[PDB]
Amino acid sequence: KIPPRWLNCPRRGQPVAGRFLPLKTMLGPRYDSQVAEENRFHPSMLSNYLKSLKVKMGLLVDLTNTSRFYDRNDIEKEGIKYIKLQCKGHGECPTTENTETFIRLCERFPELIGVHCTHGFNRTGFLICAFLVEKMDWSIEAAVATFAQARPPGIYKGDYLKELFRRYGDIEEAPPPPLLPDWCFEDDEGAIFLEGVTVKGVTQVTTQPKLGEVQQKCHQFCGWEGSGFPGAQPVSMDKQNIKLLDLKPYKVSWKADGTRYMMLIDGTNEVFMIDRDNSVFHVSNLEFPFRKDLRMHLSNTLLDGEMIIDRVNGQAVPRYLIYDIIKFNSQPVGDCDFNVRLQCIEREIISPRHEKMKTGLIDKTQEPFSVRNKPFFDICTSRKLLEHEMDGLIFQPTGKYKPGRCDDILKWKPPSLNSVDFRLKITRMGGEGLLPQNVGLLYVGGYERPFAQIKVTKELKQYDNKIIECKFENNSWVFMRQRTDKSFPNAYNTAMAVCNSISNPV
Amino acid sequence: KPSDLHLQTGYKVERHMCDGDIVIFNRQPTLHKMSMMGHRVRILPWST
Amino acid sequence: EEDASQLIFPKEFETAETLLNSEVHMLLEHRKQQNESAEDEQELSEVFMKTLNYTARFSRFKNRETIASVRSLLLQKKLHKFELACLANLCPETAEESKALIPSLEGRFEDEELQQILDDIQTKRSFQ
Amino acid sequence: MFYHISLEHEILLHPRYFGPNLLNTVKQKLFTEVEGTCTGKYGFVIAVTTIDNIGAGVIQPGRGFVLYPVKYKAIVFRPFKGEVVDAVVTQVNKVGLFTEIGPMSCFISRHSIPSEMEFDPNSNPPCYKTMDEDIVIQQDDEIRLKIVGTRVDKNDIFAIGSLMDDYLGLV
Numbered sequence: 083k084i085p086p087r088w089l090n091c092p093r094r095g096q097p098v099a100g101r102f103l104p105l106k107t108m109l110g111p112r113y114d115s116q117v118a119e120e121n122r123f124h125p126s127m128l129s130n131y132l133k134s135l136k137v138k139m140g141l142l143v144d145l146t147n148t149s150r151f152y153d154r155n156d157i158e159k160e161g162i163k164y165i166k167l168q169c170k171g172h173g174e175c176p177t178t179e180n181t182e183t184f185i186r187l188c189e190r191f192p193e194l195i196g197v198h199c200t201h202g203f204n205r206t207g208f209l210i211c212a213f214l215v216e217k218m219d220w221s222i223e224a225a226v227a228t229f230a231q232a233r234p235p236g237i238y239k240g241d242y243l244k245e246l247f248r249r250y251g252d253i254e255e256a257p258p259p260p261l262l263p264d265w266c267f268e269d270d271e272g273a274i275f276l277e278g279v280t281v282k283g284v285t286q287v288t289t290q291p292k293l294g295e296v297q298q299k300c301h302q303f304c305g306w307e308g309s310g311f312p313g314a315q316p317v318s319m320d321k322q323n324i325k326l327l328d329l330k331p332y333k334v335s336w337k338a339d340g341t342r343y344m345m346l347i348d349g350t351n352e353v354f355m356i357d358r359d360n361s362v363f364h365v366s367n368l369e370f371p372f373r374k375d376l377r378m379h380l381s382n383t384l385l386d387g388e389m390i391i392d393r394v395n396g397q398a399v400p401r402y403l404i405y406d407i408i409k410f411n412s413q414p415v416g417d418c419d420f421n422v423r424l425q426c427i428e429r430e431i432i433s434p435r436h437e438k439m440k441t442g443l444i445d446k447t448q449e450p451f452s453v454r455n456k457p458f459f460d461i462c463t464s465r466k467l468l469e470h471e472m473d474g475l476i477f478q479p480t481g482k483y484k485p486g487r488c489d490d491i492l493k494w495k496p497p498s499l500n501s502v503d504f505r506l507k508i509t510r511m512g513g514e515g516l517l518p519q520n521v522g523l524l525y526v527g528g529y530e531r532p533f534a535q536i537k538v539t540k541e542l543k544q545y546d547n548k549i550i551e552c553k554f555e556n557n558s559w560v561f562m563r564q565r566t567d568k569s570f571p572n573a574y575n576t577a578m579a580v581c582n583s584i585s586n587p588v
Numbered sequence: 589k590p591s592d593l594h595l596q597t598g599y600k601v602e603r604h605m606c607d608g609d610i611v612i613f614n615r616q617p618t619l620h621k622m623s624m625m626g627h628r629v630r631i632l633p634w635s636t
Numbered sequence: 637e638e639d640a641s642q643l644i645f646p647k648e649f650e651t652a653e654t655l656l657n658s659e660v661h662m663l664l665e666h667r668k669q670q671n672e673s674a675e676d677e678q679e680l681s682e683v684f685m686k687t688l689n690y691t692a693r694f695s696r697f698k699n700r701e702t703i704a705s706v707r708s709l710l711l712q713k714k715l716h717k718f719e720l721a722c723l724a725n726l727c728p729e730t731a732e733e734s735k736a737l738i739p740s741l742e743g744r745f746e747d748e749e750l751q752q753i754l755d756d757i758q759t760k761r762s763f764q
Numbered sequence: 765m766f767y768h769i770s771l772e773h774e775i776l777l778h779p780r781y782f783g784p785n786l787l788n789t790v791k792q793k794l795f796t797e798v799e800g801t802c803t804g805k806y807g808f809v810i811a812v813t814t815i816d817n818i819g820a821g822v823i824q825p826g827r828g829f830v831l832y833p834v835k836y837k838a839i840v841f842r843p844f845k846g847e848v849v850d851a852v853v854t855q856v857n858k859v860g861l862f863t864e865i866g867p868m869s870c871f872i873s874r875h876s877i878p879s880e881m882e883f884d885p886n887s888n889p890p891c892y893k894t895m896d897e898d899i900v901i902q903q904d905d906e907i908r909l910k911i912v913g914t915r916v917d918k919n920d921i922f923a924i925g926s927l928m929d930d931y932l933g934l935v
């Protein structure tokens with residue numbers, strides 16, 4: 083019927099009564115195609131935060147009634163007992179039988195006790211408070227208040243609190259559910275704009291009214307049925323494929339390594355950037371004048387391109403290359419020929435701005451970044467391109483604009499640097515082959531065994547069971563940087579895709 | 589699941605015996621040491 | 637069952653040969669230097685680091701020649717290894733303190749000879 | 765007391781780990797397995813001084829790994845009942861006193877601490893001190909404790925110190 087959410091909640095609350103650690107559910111690395119640094123909470127990160135504090139976690143109680151979130155062996159291989167405690171469904175509260183089971187279990191295993199449901203608020207808080215009232219002789223008021231302060235929102239289902247007070251206090255004194263984070267009851271419909279540089283006039287749009295409107299207009303301009311970023315996605319290239327690239331007079335361009343951004347020009351000060359994560363950024367001082375009326379401004383215009391970092395020695399200058407246009411004044415230019423749209427960019431976007439750039443009415447040193455268009459050439463000259471800085475070649479057919487995955491937009495980008503995300507659990511051998519021989523094991527998503535091994539160093543033990551960016555080179559995974567808030571690796575399918583790229587590169 | 593069917597050096601595999609395997613063949617009154625001898629396995633269709 | 641105040645040791649700790657704190661510091665620093673070389677060998681135990689720094693803080697004989705001199709001057713005295721090591725490690729200054737920290741020294745040596753030995757200790761203590 | 769003794773331990777070498785140099789593998793194995801360990805009968809195994817003798821390798825019947833009995837000079841430590849030992853204070857508590865002797869944690873209860881050394885949390889470091897403010901036992905001090913006894917346990921001989929008798933406290 084009605085929805086829960088997962089991405090924005092804290093990974094853990096404060097310990098309750100010095101015994102219980104409330105948690106949201108860990109997820110397996112099987113989901114890493116859906117999540118990353120900000121919103122990845124992984125069993126190794128938990129066991130590892132505990133190891134770094136020299137704390138053992140005893141028993142972990144799973145209240146989710148499911149095994150699709152993570153592998154229990156990731157918890158049990160660390161010496162932590164794992165129990166899956168089935169609770170009453172249909173949105174009802176844990177029964178007295180469920181509470182008795184929880185109390186019987188928890189009175190066995192100083193060490194913490196981890197308790198988690200999908201979110202770590204309602205079932206977790208209910209069972210923890212019941213344990214506090216019975217086992218620790220707390221008052222129900224104190225237990226509820228302490229859980230509300232420890233887990234930052236706390237229990238927020240009214241019937242949960244009413245049943246707690248009916249069982250352990252006066253039901254007429256049960257508090258109403260707390261006012262939820264107004265900001266968190268919102269992901270129902272990246273924070274850094276450009277990595278490495280700070281850009282003026284560009285501020286992220288989190289305002290709930292206008293964010294959905296900008297996303298909606300982009301959807302409708304692209305004709306995108308599903309949810310998410312509507313821009314065209316170029317795909318991998320490696321096969322007998324360059325002839326396909328010369329089938330529909332494709333144009334070639336060098337691909338600078340940049341950040342994908344569609345630009346929606348909706349009005350006077352309404353200039354917005356949209357990245358692959360559907361995040362919206364408002365640009366202030368970018369002016370797009372109408373070609374015919376230089377005083378008037380553009381509306382209902384959608385662009386596409388990359389944000390690249392140019393280096394004028396001593397400082398890095400941001401640049402936005404427009405390498406396609408979807409709509410112009412509501413005219414579906416995206417349905418026209420790719421040459422027609424290239425001319426539309428040049429003649430209706432760059433030229434009207436460049437007229438006022440020589441009149442003094444537009445000052446380029448005021449604008450947030452430089453706006454240019456990406457040159458395209460025939461493939462006959464692409465061969466010469468193989469004979470600002472490009473990490474590869476893009477390969478664009480001359481047909482009409484298509485959203486989503488484009489099997490016919492081919493990416494040809496020099497690799498030789500293909501990292502992978504990898505959970506690094508360092509294990510010293512003890513057992514059959516009892517040797518010093520302590521090797522760091524790298525793990526991936528939905529794959530129970532280690533995916534690879536990494537040579538242990540003095541530096542590497544720093545991030546153990548952590549997440550550690552590892553480039554591939556010289557037939558070895560090489561640590562490059564810690565992904566300091568991502569929890570454990572990328573999915574096994576993603577890792578295998580990377581490896582397929584490295585061994586059959588483009 | 590096909591995930592835990594890998595093999596690295598060190599595992600044991602209790603495989604069905606093939607041709608060339610060694611077996612001990614004996615009858616009951618083992619009155620001497622030639623009543624219990626080692627043979628090589630040959631796989632033949634019928635059940636004898 | 638055991639008692640260090642009356643040299644009551646287990647049968648396992650009958651051939652136990654004692655060591656000085658400076659001896660332990662020197663040998664463990666030599667082991668640390670061996671670990672510095674001979675690569676493809678990981679760091680030693682947390683016990684190793686704790687013991688090494690602990691005996692580095694409480695080291696009293698800064699020279700191995702001082703170690704040899706103290707060992708030669710005390711080894712020719714009618715002492716057990718445990719009493720010898722405890723005297724050379726705690727380093728008391730009054731014979732009353734020598735008999736109080738080690739109650740097994742009651743009557744082993746004359747208290748004037750004991751004070752002579754303690755003064756020899758304070759003579760051979762490498763000051764800081 | 766810091767001891768230099770000879771100990772006997774048996775190493776299991778599997779054929780995958782023979783290598784061209786076989787004895788160096790055994791030496792690394794011994795430096796790996798027993799260093800930093802603690803046994804109830806021999807105390808804190810600090811380090812192995814010199815691997816003296818390597819025994820004959822008995823191939824276990826049915827098993828693949830060879831077994832090496834090894835004798836080695838080793839530096840160890842054992843806490844003793846009644847031994848006065850120097851220590852480093854790590855924490856002063858109203859219940860007791862957390863000190864360290866090498867890697868060993870030593871807990872000196874206040875009930876076995878004389879009435880002169882009272883506890884004070886009002887000082888910026890919570891410490892043990894007298895009303896004369898002469899003997900100030902605080903964190904990171906050099907003190908002496910006469911071991912009441914030690915809790916001999918699995919890989920642990922954590923001791924209990926005494927301050928009741930004479931000349932015990934701050935150095």
Ligand SMILES: *O[C@H]1[C@@H](O)[C@H](n2cnc3c(=O)[nH]c(N)nc32)O[C@@H]1COP(=O)(O)OP(=O)(O)OP(=O)(O)O
Pocket residue numbers: 146147148149150
């Ligand atoms: O053994 C599993 C699995 O076989 C079965 N199952 C789960 N989803 C499906 C499905 O879409 N189609 C079929 N035929 N079978 C399915 O359920 C078994 C486990 O049940 P769960 O308790 O794990 O179901 P769960 O609680 O995970 O659902 P939810 O509470 O997460 O929504």
